[PDB]
Amino acid sequence: SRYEKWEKIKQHYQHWSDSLSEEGRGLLKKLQIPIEPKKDDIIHSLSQEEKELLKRIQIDSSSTEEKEFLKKLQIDIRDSLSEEEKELLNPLSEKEKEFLKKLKLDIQPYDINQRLQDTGGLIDSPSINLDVRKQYKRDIQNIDALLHQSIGSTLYNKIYLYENMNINNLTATLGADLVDSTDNTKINRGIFNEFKKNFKYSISSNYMIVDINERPALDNERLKWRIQLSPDTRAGYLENGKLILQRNIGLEIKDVQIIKQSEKEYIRIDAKVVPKSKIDTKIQEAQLNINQEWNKALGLPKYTKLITFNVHNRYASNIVESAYLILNEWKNNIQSDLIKKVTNYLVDGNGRFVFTDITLPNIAEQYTHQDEIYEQVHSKGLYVPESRSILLHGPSKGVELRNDSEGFIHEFGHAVDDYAGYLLDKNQSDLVTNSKKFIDIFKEEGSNLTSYGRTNEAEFFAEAFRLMHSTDHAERLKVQKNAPKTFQFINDQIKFIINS
Ligand SMILES: COCc1cccc(S(=O)(=O)N(CC(C)C)[C@@H](C(=O)NO)C(C)C)c1
Numbered sequence: 001s002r003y004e005k006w007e008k009i010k011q012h013y014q015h016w017s018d019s020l021s022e023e024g025r026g027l028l029k030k031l032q033i034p035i036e037p038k039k040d041d042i043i044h045s046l047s048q049e050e051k052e053l054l055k056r057i058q059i060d061s062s063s064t065e066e067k068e069f070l071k072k073l074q075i076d077i078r079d080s081l082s083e084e085e086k087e088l089l090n091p092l093s094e095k096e097k098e099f100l101k102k103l104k105l106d107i108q109p110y111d112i113n114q115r116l117q118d119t120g121g122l123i124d125s126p127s128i129n130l131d132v133r134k135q136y137k138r139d140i141q142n143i144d145a146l147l148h149q150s151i152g153s154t155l156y157n158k159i160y161l162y163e164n165m166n167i168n169n170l171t172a173t174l175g176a177d178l179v180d181s182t183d184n185t186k187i188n189r190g191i192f193n194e195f196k197k198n199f200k201y202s203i204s205s206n207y208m209i210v211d212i213n214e215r216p217a218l219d220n221e222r223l224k225w226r227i228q229l230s231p232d233t234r235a236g237y238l239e240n241g242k243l244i245l246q247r248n249i250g251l252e253i254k255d256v257q258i259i260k261q262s263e264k265e266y267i268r269i270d271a272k273v274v275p276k277s278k279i280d281t282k283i284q285e286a287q288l289n290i291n292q293e294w295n296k297a298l299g300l301p302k303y304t305k306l307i308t309f310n311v312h313n314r315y316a317s318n319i320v321e322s323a324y325l326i327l328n329e330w331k332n333n334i335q336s337d338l339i340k341k342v343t344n345y346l347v348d349g350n351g352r353f354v355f356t357d358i359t360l361p362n363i364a365e366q367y368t369h370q371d372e373i374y375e376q377v378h379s380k381g382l383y384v385p386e387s388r389s390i391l392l393h394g395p396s397k398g399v400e401l402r403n404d405s406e407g408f409i410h411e412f413g414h415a416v417d418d419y420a421g422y423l424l425d426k427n428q429s430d431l432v433t434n435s436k437k438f439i440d441i442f443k444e445e446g447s448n449l450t451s452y453g454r455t456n457e458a459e460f461f462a463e464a465f466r467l468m469h470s471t472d473h474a475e476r477l478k479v480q481k482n483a484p485k486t487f488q489f490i491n492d493q494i495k496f497i498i499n500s
Protein backbone atom coordinates (compact mmCIF):
# COMPACT_ATOMS: atom_id res chain seq x y z
CA SER A 1 0.00 0.00 0.00
CA ARG A 2 1.21 3.49 -0.95
CA TYR A 3 -0.19 5.36 2.03
CA GLU A 4 0.84 2.60 4.45
CA LYS A 5 4.42 2.54 3.17
CA TRP A 6 4.45 6.34 3.40
CA GLU A 7 3.39 6.36 7.07
CA LYS A 8 5.86 3.59 7.91
CA ILE A 9 8.79 5.65 6.62
CA LYS A 10 7.56 8.88 8.22
CA GLN A 11 7.38 7.04 11.55
CA HIS A 12 10.93 5.76 11.09
CA TYR A 13 12.07 9.39 10.87
CA GLN A 14 9.50 10.99 13.19
CA HIS A 15 11.94 11.58 16.05
CA TRP A 16 14.42 12.92 13.51
CA SER A 17 11.85 15.35 12.07
CA ASP A 18 10.57 16.61 15.43
CA SER A 19 14.19 17.15 16.52
CA LEU A 20 14.89 19.57 13.67
CA SER A 21 15.66 23.14 14.71
CA GLU A 22 14.29 26.23 12.97
CA GLU A 23 17.55 26.65 11.05
CA GLY A 24 17.57 22.96 10.12
CA ARG A 25 14.16 23.04 8.46
CA GLY A 26 14.83 26.29 6.61
CA LEU A 27 18.09 24.80 5.37
CA LEU A 28 16.21 21.78 4.02
CA LYS A 29 13.63 24.11 2.46
CA LYS A 30 16.30 26.28 0.83
CA LEU A 31 17.80 23.16 -0.73
CA GLN A 32 14.52 22.04 -2.28
CA ILE A 33 13.58 25.55 -3.41
CA PRO A 34 16.70 27.45 -4.57
CA ILE A 35 16.72 31.22 -4.03
CA GLU A 36 16.31 32.82 -7.45
CA PRO A 37 17.96 36.13 -8.41
CA LYS A 38 15.97 39.29 -7.95
CA LYS A 39 15.49 40.59 -11.47
CA ASP A 40 14.28 43.94 -10.16
CA ASP A 41 17.53 44.40 -8.25
CA ILE A 42 19.54 43.27 -11.27
CA ILE A 43 17.96 45.75 -13.67
CA HIS A 44 18.19 48.54 -11.10
CA SER A 45 21.95 47.97 -10.86
CA LEU A 46 22.52 48.54 -14.57
CA SER A 47 23.36 51.84 -16.20
CA GLN A 48 20.66 52.96 -18.62
CA GLU A 49 23.06 52.47 -21.53
CA GLU A 50 23.38 48.86 -20.36
CA LYS A 51 19.59 48.55 -20.15
CA GLU A 52 19.31 49.72 -23.76
CA LEU A 53 22.09 47.29 -24.61
CA LEU A 54 20.32 44.47 -22.78
CA LYS A 55 17.01 45.52 -24.35
CA ARG A 56 17.98 44.99 -27.99
CA ILE A 57 20.54 42.20 -27.57
CA GLN A 58 20.04 38.78 -29.18
CA ILE A 59 20.98 36.81 -26.08
CA ASP A 60 21.11 33.30 -27.57
CA SER A 61 24.26 34.06 -29.59
CA SER A 62 26.55 33.48 -26.60
CA SER A 63 22.62 27.66 -19.83
CA THR A 64 19.27 27.96 -21.61
CA GLU A 65 17.79 29.14 -18.32
CA GLU A 66 20.47 31.84 -18.17
CA LYS A 67 19.26 32.94 -21.59
CA GLU A 68 15.68 32.43 -20.41
CA PHE A 69 16.31 34.46 -17.26
CA LEU A 70 18.02 37.15 -19.32
CA LYS A 71 15.01 37.00 -21.66
CA LYS A 72 12.84 37.11 -18.57
CA LEU A 73 15.13 39.98 -17.60
CA GLN A 74 14.81 41.67 -21.00
CA ILE A 75 11.02 41.26 -21.20
CA ASP A 76 10.71 42.95 -17.81
CA ILE A 77 12.82 45.83 -19.10
CA ARG A 78 10.92 45.97 -22.40
CA ASP A 79 7.45 46.12 -20.83
CA SER A 80 7.39 49.93 -20.81
CA LEU A 81 7.42 50.81 -24.51
CA SER A 82 5.33 50.46 -27.68
CA GLU A 83 3.52 47.34 -28.84
CA GLU A 84 4.93 47.94 -32.30
CA GLU A 85 8.46 48.28 -30.94
CA LYS A 86 8.24 44.97 -29.07
CA GLU A 87 6.93 43.11 -32.12
CA LEU A 88 9.73 44.70 -34.15
CA LEU A 89 12.37 43.72 -31.59
CA ASN A 90 11.14 40.14 -31.95
CA PRO A 91 27.80 36.80 -33.45
CA LEU A 92 27.72 39.37 -30.63
CA SER A 93 29.48 42.71 -30.43
CA GLU A 94 32.65 42.42 -28.37
CA LYS A 95 31.01 45.20 -26.38
CA GLU A 96 28.02 42.87 -25.94
CA LYS A 97 29.81 39.65 -24.99
CA GLU A 98 32.18 41.49 -22.64
CA PHE A 99 29.06 42.83 -20.95
CA LEU A 100 27.37 39.43 -20.69
CA LYS A 101 30.50 37.79 -19.30
CA LYS A 102 30.32 40.08 -16.27
CA LEU A 103 26.51 39.91 -16.03
CA LYS A 104 26.65 36.11 -15.71
CA LEU A 105 28.17 36.42 -12.23
CA ASP A 106 25.21 38.48 -10.98
CA ILE A 107 22.36 36.24 -12.15
CA GLN A 108 23.36 33.00 -10.45
CA PRO A 109 20.74 31.56 -8.04
CA TYR A 110 21.77 30.05 -4.71
CA ASP A 111 21.24 26.39 -5.56
CA ILE A 112 23.02 23.93 -3.27
CA ASN A 113 22.20 20.81 -5.31
CA GLN A 114 23.25 22.56 -8.52
CA ARG A 115 26.51 23.77 -6.98
CA LEU A 116 27.27 20.18 -6.01
CA GLN A 117 26.40 18.69 -9.40
CA ASP A 118 28.36 21.33 -11.35
CA THR A 119 31.49 20.86 -9.24
CA GLY A 120 30.97 17.14 -8.66
CA GLY A 121 31.40 17.69 -4.94
CA LEU A 122 34.59 19.72 -5.38
CA ILE A 123 33.02 22.82 -3.85
CA ASP A 124 36.38 24.55 -3.41
CA SER A 125 36.54 25.08 -7.19
CA PRO A 126 37.19 28.81 -7.76
CA SER A 127 34.25 29.25 -10.16
CA ILE A 128 32.11 31.45 -7.92
CA ASN A 129 32.56 34.37 -5.51
CA LEU A 130 34.68 33.33 -2.52
CA ASP A 131 32.13 34.46 0.09
CA VAL A 132 29.31 32.58 -1.64
CA ARG A 133 31.64 29.59 -2.06
CA LYS A 134 32.12 29.52 1.70
CA GLN A 135 28.37 29.86 2.22
CA TYR A 136 27.66 26.74 0.15
CA LYS A 137 30.33 24.93 2.16
CA ARG A 138 28.65 25.80 5.48
CA ASP A 139 25.18 24.74 4.30
CA ILE A 140 26.47 21.54 2.70
CA GLN A 141 28.40 20.58 5.83
CA ASN A 142 25.33 21.40 7.95
CA ILE A 143 23.05 19.32 5.73
CA ASP A 144 25.51 16.43 6.01
CA ALA A 145 25.25 16.72 9.79
CA LEU A 146 21.44 16.69 9.57
CA LEU A 147 21.27 13.56 7.44
CA HIS A 148 22.73 11.19 10.03
CA GLN A 149 19.99 8.58 10.41
CA SER A 150 20.13 5.65 8.00
CA ILE A 151 17.14 3.91 6.43
CA GLY A 152 17.99 0.92 8.63
CA SER A 153 18.29 -2.84 8.21
CA THR A 154 14.53 -3.34 8.44
CA LEU A 155 13.20 -1.06 5.70
CA TYR A 156 15.97 -1.06 3.07
CA ASN A 157 14.75 -4.20 1.27
CA LYS A 158 11.01 -3.71 1.81
CA ILE A 159 10.60 -0.43 -0.09
CA TYR A 160 11.35 1.15 -3.46
CA LEU A 161 12.01 4.86 -3.91
CA TYR A 162 11.30 6.72 -7.14
CA GLU A 163 12.67 9.64 -9.13
CA ASN A 164 11.21 11.16 -12.29
CA MET A 165 13.86 12.73 -14.53
CA ASN A 166 14.35 14.60 -17.80
CA ILE A 167 16.53 12.77 -20.34
CA ASN A 168 18.51 15.88 -21.29
CA ASN A 169 19.87 16.00 -17.73
CA LEU A 170 21.95 12.87 -18.33
CA THR A 171 22.99 13.65 -21.91
CA ALA A 172 21.29 16.33 -24.00
CA THR A 173 22.94 14.74 -27.04
CA LEU A 174 20.92 11.51 -26.90
CA GLY A 175 17.92 13.22 -25.31
CA ALA A 176 17.21 15.04 -28.56
CA ASP A 177 16.31 11.85 -30.43
CA LEU A 178 15.39 9.17 -27.89
CA VAL A 179 11.73 10.02 -28.31
CA ASP A 180 10.32 8.82 -31.64
CA SER A 181 9.73 11.73 -34.02
CA THR A 182 6.81 10.07 -35.81
CA ASP A 183 5.20 9.16 -32.48
CA ASN A 184 6.14 11.01 -29.29
CA THR A 185 4.45 8.36 -27.14
CA LYS A 186 7.07 5.88 -28.32
CA ILE A 187 10.75 5.49 -27.47
CA ASN A 188 13.28 4.98 -30.27
CA ARG A 189 14.36 1.34 -29.89
CA GLY A 190 17.70 2.04 -31.54
CA ILE A 191 18.97 4.72 -29.19
CA PHE A 192 17.53 2.83 -26.22
CA ASN A 193 19.75 -0.20 -26.86
CA GLU A 194 22.90 1.93 -26.97
CA PHE A 195 21.72 3.93 -23.96
CA LYS A 196 21.18 0.66 -22.10
CA LYS A 197 24.44 -0.92 -23.27
CA ASN A 198 26.67 1.73 -21.71
CA PHE A 199 24.81 2.47 -18.48
CA LYS A 200 26.22 0.14 -15.81
CA TYR A 201 26.79 2.56 -12.92
CA SER A 202 25.78 6.00 -11.66
CA ILE A 203 26.97 8.56 -9.10
CA SER A 204 25.05 11.14 -7.08
CA SER A 205 27.30 13.97 -5.91
CA ASN A 206 24.39 16.05 -4.62
CA TYR A 207 21.35 15.33 -2.46
CA MET A 208 18.86 13.16 -4.36
CA ILE A 209 15.25 14.01 -3.57
CA VAL A 210 13.14 10.91 -4.14
CA ASP A 211 9.44 10.06 -3.97
CA ILE A 212 8.22 7.41 -1.52
CA ASN A 213 5.43 6.58 -3.97
CA GLU A 214 5.85 6.75 -7.75
CA ARG A 215 4.58 10.04 -9.16
CA PRO A 216 3.02 10.22 -12.65
CA ALA A 217 5.33 11.77 -15.25
CA LEU A 218 5.15 15.44 -16.14
CA ASP A 219 5.99 16.98 -19.53
CA ASN A 220 9.53 15.82 -20.31
CA GLU A 221 9.88 13.25 -17.54
CA ARG A 222 10.41 10.18 -19.73
CA LEU A 223 12.88 8.65 -17.26
CA LYS A 224 11.50 6.84 -14.20
CA TRP A 225 14.10 5.66 -11.70
CA ARG A 226 13.27 2.90 -9.22
CA ILE A 227 15.83 2.91 -6.43
CA GLN A 228 16.59 0.41 -3.69
CA LEU A 229 18.59 1.83 -0.79
CA SER A 230 21.33 0.09 1.17
CA PRO A 231 20.80 -0.51 4.94
CA ASP A 232 23.14 2.32 6.00
CA THR A 233 22.08 4.85 3.37
CA ARG A 234 21.53 8.04 5.34
CA ALA A 235 18.37 9.97 4.53
CA GLY A 236 15.73 12.36 5.86
CA TYR A 237 11.96 12.60 5.52
CA LEU A 238 10.49 15.52 3.59
CA GLU A 239 6.85 16.61 3.66
CA ASN A 240 4.43 15.15 1.10
CA GLY A 241 5.97 11.69 0.94
CA LYS A 242 9.57 12.34 -0.06
CA LEU A 243 13.06 11.39 1.12
CA ILE A 244 16.26 13.39 0.86
CA LEU A 245 19.24 11.08 0.39
CA GLN A 246 22.80 11.79 1.51
CA ARG A 247 25.25 13.10 -1.08
CA ASN A 248 28.14 11.07 -2.54
CA ILE A 249 26.42 7.74 -3.15
CA GLY A 250 26.89 5.22 -5.95
CA LEU A 251 24.21 3.40 -7.91
CA GLU A 252 24.61 0.13 -9.80
CA ILE A 253 22.25 -0.07 -12.76
CA LYS A 254 20.43 -3.37 -12.36
CA ASP A 255 17.96 -3.08 -15.23
CA VAL A 256 16.88 -0.65 -17.94
CA GLN A 257 13.58 -1.43 -19.65
CA ILE A 258 10.94 0.26 -21.77
CA ILE A 259 7.59 0.21 -19.99
CA LYS A 260 4.08 1.48 -20.65
CA GLN A 261 2.29 3.95 -18.43
CA SER A 262 -1.02 5.28 -19.69
CA GLU A 263 -0.50 4.37 -23.36
CA LYS A 264 2.80 6.29 -23.37
CA GLU A 265 6.27 4.72 -23.28
CA TYR A 266 8.81 5.52 -20.56
CA ILE A 267 12.26 4.25 -19.65
CA ARG A 268 12.46 2.56 -16.26
CA ILE A 269 15.84 2.58 -14.57
CA ASP A 270 16.27 0.13 -11.71
CA ALA A 271 19.26 0.99 -9.54
CA LYS A 272 20.72 -0.20 -6.23
CA VAL A 273 22.60 2.11 -3.86
CA VAL A 274 26.22 0.99 -3.44
CA PRO A 275 29.27 2.62 -1.84
CA LYS A 276 30.50 5.46 -4.06
CA SER A 277 34.09 4.26 -3.62
CA LYS A 278 33.16 0.95 -5.25
CA ILE A 279 32.19 2.87 -8.38
CA ASP A 280 35.11 5.31 -8.21
CA THR A 281 37.27 2.19 -8.33
CA LYS A 282 35.68 1.00 -11.58
CA ILE A 283 36.18 4.49 -13.00
CA GLN A 284 39.85 4.67 -12.00
CA GLU A 285 40.41 1.14 -13.31
CA ALA A 286 38.89 2.21 -16.62
CA GLN A 287 41.06 5.33 -16.68
CA LEU A 288 44.25 3.32 -16.23
CA ASN A 289 43.18 0.83 -18.90
CA ILE A 290 42.35 3.37 -21.62
CA ASN A 291 45.67 5.09 -20.94
CA GLN A 292 47.54 1.79 -21.24
CA GLU A 293 45.86 1.16 -24.60
CA TRP A 294 46.54 4.61 -25.99
CA ASN A 295 50.07 4.90 -24.62
CA LYS A 296 51.07 1.82 -26.62
CA ALA A 297 49.01 2.85 -29.65
CA LEU A 298 50.59 6.33 -29.72
CA GLY A 299 54.12 5.22 -28.91
CA LEU A 300 54.10 6.85 -25.49
CA PRO A 301 55.75 5.90 -22.17
CA LYS A 302 53.77 3.14 -20.43
CA TYR A 303 52.78 5.22 -17.41
CA THR A 304 51.91 8.50 -19.17
CA LYS A 305 48.83 10.24 -17.77
CA LEU A 306 47.08 11.57 -20.87
CA ILE A 307 43.42 10.64 -20.50
CA THR A 308 41.50 11.81 -17.44
CA PHE A 309 38.07 10.67 -16.28
CA ASN A 310 36.72 13.53 -14.19
CA VAL A 311 33.42 11.81 -13.53
CA HIS A 312 31.03 12.60 -10.65
CA ASN A 313 27.42 12.53 -11.87
CA ARG A 314 24.35 10.48 -12.75
CA TYR A 315 25.34 9.18 -16.18
CA ALA A 316 28.89 8.31 -15.07
CA SER A 317 29.57 5.09 -16.98
CA ASN A 318 28.72 6.58 -20.38
CA ILE A 319 31.22 9.39 -20.01
CA VAL A 320 33.69 6.54 -19.61
CA GLU A 321 32.27 4.51 -22.50
CA SER A 322 32.02 7.53 -24.81
CA ALA A 323 35.69 8.41 -24.43
CA TYR A 324 36.60 5.04 -25.94
CA LEU A 325 34.38 5.61 -28.99
CA ILE A 326 35.42 9.24 -29.42
CA LEU A 327 39.14 8.48 -29.43
CA ASN A 328 38.50 5.63 -31.88
CA GLU A 329 36.72 7.89 -34.39
CA TRP A 330 39.55 10.36 -33.78
CA LYS A 331 42.12 7.68 -34.62
CA ASN A 332 40.21 6.51 -37.70
CA ASN A 333 39.72 9.91 -39.35
CA ILE A 334 43.13 11.50 -38.71
CA GLN A 335 46.58 10.50 -40.00
CA SER A 336 48.51 8.54 -37.36
CA ASP A 337 51.59 10.75 -37.78
CA LEU A 338 49.61 13.97 -37.34
CA ILE A 339 48.17 12.46 -34.18
CA LYS A 340 51.44 11.23 -32.63
CA LYS A 341 53.32 14.47 -33.34
CA VAL A 342 50.66 16.76 -31.87
CA THR A 343 49.86 14.48 -28.93
CA ASN A 344 53.54 14.20 -27.98
CA TYR A 345 53.59 17.99 -27.98
CA LEU A 346 50.67 18.12 -25.55
CA VAL A 347 52.37 15.56 -23.31
CA ASP A 348 55.49 17.76 -23.26
CA GLY A 349 53.34 20.47 -21.69
CA ASN A 350 51.74 17.98 -19.30
CA GLY A 351 48.45 18.02 -21.21
CA ARG A 352 45.29 15.96 -20.82
CA PHE A 353 42.26 14.70 -22.67
CA VAL A 354 39.64 15.40 -20.00
CA PHE A 355 36.30 13.59 -20.24
CA THR A 356 33.96 14.90 -17.56
CA ASP A 357 30.38 15.29 -16.36
CA ILE A 358 31.17 18.41 -14.34
CA THR A 359 31.19 21.90 -15.83
CA LEU A 360 34.39 23.09 -17.49
CA PRO A 361 34.87 26.13 -15.23
CA ASN A 362 35.33 23.57 -12.44
CA ILE A 363 38.02 21.73 -14.41
CA ALA A 364 41.51 22.44 -13.04
CA GLU A 365 42.97 22.32 -16.56
CA GLN A 366 41.01 25.54 -17.13
CA TYR A 367 40.63 27.49 -13.90
CA THR A 368 44.29 27.24 -12.84
CA HIS A 369 44.99 29.41 -15.89
CA GLN A 370 41.82 31.48 -15.66
CA ASP A 371 41.49 33.36 -12.36
CA GLU A 372 38.77 35.75 -13.54
CA ILE A 373 35.44 33.93 -13.39
CA TYR A 374 34.04 36.24 -16.08
CA GLU A 375 36.65 34.72 -18.40
CA GLN A 376 35.85 31.15 -17.36
CA VAL A 377 33.93 29.29 -20.05
CA HIS A 378 31.40 26.49 -19.93
CA SER A 379 30.63 24.66 -23.14
CA LYS A 380 30.65 21.15 -24.58
CA GLY A 381 34.33 21.26 -25.43
CA LEU A 382 37.42 23.40 -25.08
CA TYR A 383 41.13 23.57 -25.82
CA VAL A 384 43.34 25.24 -23.23
CA PRO A 385 46.79 26.09 -24.66
CA GLU A 386 48.14 27.09 -21.23
CA SER A 387 47.61 23.51 -20.04
CA ARG A 388 47.70 21.96 -23.52
CA SER A 389 44.49 20.11 -22.72
CA ILE A 390 41.27 19.12 -24.44
CA LEU A 391 38.21 19.25 -22.20
CA LEU A 392 34.98 17.53 -23.20
CA HIS A 393 31.73 17.94 -21.27
CA GLY A 394 29.50 14.92 -21.87
CA PRO A 395 26.03 16.00 -20.63
CA SER A 396 25.56 19.36 -22.40
CA LYS A 397 24.29 19.94 -25.94
CA GLY A 398 26.74 21.29 -28.49
CA VAL A 399 26.38 24.05 -31.07
CA GLU A 400 25.71 22.86 -34.63
CA LEU A 401 27.56 19.55 -34.15
CA ARG A 402 26.05 16.06 -34.27
CA ASN A 403 28.08 13.79 -31.99
CA ASP A 404 30.96 14.26 -29.56
CA SER A 405 33.40 12.58 -31.97
CA GLU A 406 33.20 15.59 -34.28
CA GLY A 407 33.58 17.79 -31.23
CA PHE A 408 36.85 16.22 -30.13
CA ILE A 409 38.38 16.39 -33.61
CA HIS A 410 37.43 20.07 -33.65
CA GLU A 411 39.24 20.53 -30.34
CA PHE A 412 42.21 18.62 -31.75
CA GLY A 413 42.26 21.12 -34.60
CA HIS A 414 42.98 23.73 -31.96
CA ALA A 415 45.97 21.72 -30.75
CA VAL A 416 47.12 21.43 -34.36
CA ASP A 417 46.82 25.21 -34.67
CA ASP A 418 48.87 25.55 -31.49
CA TYR A 419 51.61 23.11 -32.52
CA ALA A 420 51.87 24.61 -36.00
CA GLY A 421 52.61 28.04 -34.54
CA TYR A 422 55.11 26.57 -32.09
CA LEU A 423 57.19 24.89 -34.79
CA LEU A 424 57.08 28.17 -36.70
CA ASP A 425 58.81 29.93 -33.80
CA LYS A 426 59.68 27.90 -30.71
CA ASN A 427 60.56 31.00 -28.67
CA GLN A 428 57.44 33.04 -29.40
CA SER A 429 55.06 30.06 -29.29
CA ASP A 430 51.94 31.70 -30.71
CA LEU A 431 48.96 30.22 -32.59
CA VAL A 432 49.49 29.88 -36.34
CA THR A 433 46.06 31.47 -36.84
CA ASN A 434 47.51 34.64 -35.38
CA SER A 435 49.92 34.71 -38.33
CA LYS A 436 49.12 37.45 -40.84
CA LYS A 437 48.82 35.03 -43.74
CA PHE A 438 45.94 33.15 -42.14
CA ILE A 439 44.37 36.37 -40.87
CA ASP A 440 43.96 37.52 -44.46
CA ILE A 441 42.67 34.06 -45.37
CA PHE A 442 40.06 34.43 -42.63
CA LYS A 443 39.04 37.90 -43.80
CA GLU A 444 38.10 36.39 -47.17
CA GLU A 445 36.91 32.80 -46.68
CA GLY A 446 35.87 33.22 -43.05
CA SER A 447 32.16 33.32 -43.90
CA ASN A 448 32.03 30.30 -46.20
CA LEU A 449 32.08 27.42 -43.73
CA THR A 450 29.97 26.77 -40.62
CA SER A 451 28.12 29.57 -38.84
CA TYR A 452 30.29 29.17 -35.75
CA GLY A 453 33.39 29.17 -37.94
CA ARG A 454 32.70 32.88 -38.43
CA THR A 455 33.56 33.65 -34.80
CA ASN A 456 37.30 34.15 -35.29
CA GLU A 457 40.46 32.85 -36.95
CA ALA A 458 41.08 30.14 -34.36
CA GLU A 459 37.49 28.91 -34.56
CA PHE A 460 37.44 29.06 -38.36
CA PHE A 461 40.61 26.95 -38.49
CA ALA A 462 39.16 24.39 -36.08
CA GLU A 463 35.87 24.05 -37.97
CA ALA A 464 37.77 23.82 -41.26
CA PHE A 465 40.00 21.10 -39.80
CA ARG A 466 37.00 19.16 -38.52
CA LEU A 467 35.20 19.16 -41.87
CA MET A 468 38.40 18.14 -43.67
CA HIS A 469 38.45 15.01 -41.51
CA SER A 470 34.75 14.14 -41.61
CA THR A 471 33.44 10.69 -42.54
CA ASP A 472 31.07 12.47 -44.91
CA HIS A 473 32.86 12.83 -48.25
CA ALA A 474 30.68 15.79 -49.24
CA GLU A 475 31.73 17.99 -46.34
CA ARG A 476 35.42 17.41 -47.03
CA LEU A 477 34.82 18.61 -50.58
CA LYS A 478 32.84 21.66 -49.45
CA VAL A 479 35.94 22.94 -47.65
CA GLN A 480 38.18 22.28 -50.65
CA LYS A 481 35.56 24.10 -52.75
CA ASN A 482 34.18 26.92 -50.58
CA ALA A 483 37.47 27.67 -48.83
CA PRO A 484 40.37 26.60 -51.10
CA LYS A 485 42.93 28.89 -49.44
CA THR A 486 41.99 27.59 -45.98
CA PHE A 487 41.92 24.02 -47.29
CA GLN A 488 45.46 24.29 -48.65
CA PHE A 489 46.71 26.21 -45.61
CA ILE A 490 45.76 23.40 -43.23
CA ASN A 491 47.24 20.69 -45.46
CA ASP A 492 50.38 22.83 -45.47
CA GLN A 493 50.52 22.85 -41.67
CA ILE A 494 49.75 19.13 -41.53
CA LYS A 495 52.64 18.46 -43.92
CA PHE A 496 54.77 20.88 -41.90
CA ILE A 497 54.04 19.15 -38.58
CA ILE A 498 54.61 15.61 -39.87
CA ASN A 499 57.98 16.43 -41.45
CA SER A 500 59.39 17.87 -38.20
C1 LIG B 1 27.86 17.44 -29.45
O1 LIG B 1 29.12 18.05 -29.16
C2 LIG B 1 29.29 19.26 -29.89
C3 LIG B 1 30.45 20.08 -29.35
C4 LIG B 1 31.66 19.47 -29.04
C5 LIG B 1 32.71 20.24 -28.55
C6 LIG B 1 32.55 21.61 -28.36
C7 LIG B 1 31.34 22.21 -28.67
S1 LIG B 1 31.10 23.77 -28.46
O2 LIG B 1 31.16 24.01 -27.04
O3 LIG B 1 29.77 24.07 -28.91
N1 LIG B 1 32.08 24.70 -29.16
C8 LIG B 1 31.96 25.09 -30.57
C9 LIG B 1 31.76 23.84 -31.44
C10 LIG B 1 31.26 24.20 -32.84
C11 LIG B 1 33.03 23.01 -31.53
C12 LIG B 1 33.19 25.33 -28.43
C13 LIG B 1 34.52 25.35 -29.14
O4 LIG B 1 34.76 26.27 -30.26
N2 LIG B 1 35.52 24.53 -28.71
O5 LIG B 1 36.77 24.60 -29.22
C14 LIG B 1 32.84 26.80 -28.18
C15 LIG B 1 31.44 27.07 -27.63
C16 LIG B 1 33.89 27.45 -27.28
C17 LIG B 1 30.29 21.44 -29.16
Ligand SMILES: [Zn+2]
Pocket residue numbers: 410414458459462
Ligand atom coordinates in the same frame (compact mmCIF):
# COMPACT_ATOMS: atom_id res chain seq x y z
ZN1 LIG C 1 36.74 25.99 -30.75
